[PDB]
Amino acid sequence: RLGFVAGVINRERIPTFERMLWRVCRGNVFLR
């Protein structure tokens, strides 16, 4: 039904961004 938000982040923090997002959301999310 819904499910969109997009934004900007620096390249030097992307590896720890996707790992922290994987941890507190507990799966069920899609990041490209």
Binding site: R1, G27, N28, V29, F30
Partner: protein
């Protein structure tokens, strides 16, 4: 490989929400059925009672 697991868990979730939210409407389609029929029978019977 791992991201294909994260997709298919959500594909199960979005169809589960579609199956559930239709079912509460399906429960609403039966609960509002028996009370609107019971009401409109009464308003029919109240009119004919005055005509009685």
């Amino acid at each position: 490989a791992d991201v294909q697991k994260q997709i298919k868990h959500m594909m199960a979730f979005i169809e589960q929400e579609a199956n559930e939210k239709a079912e509460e409407i399906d429960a609403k389609a039966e609960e509002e059925f028996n009370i609107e029929k019971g009401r409109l029978v009464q308003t029919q019977r109240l009119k004919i009672m005055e005509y009685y």
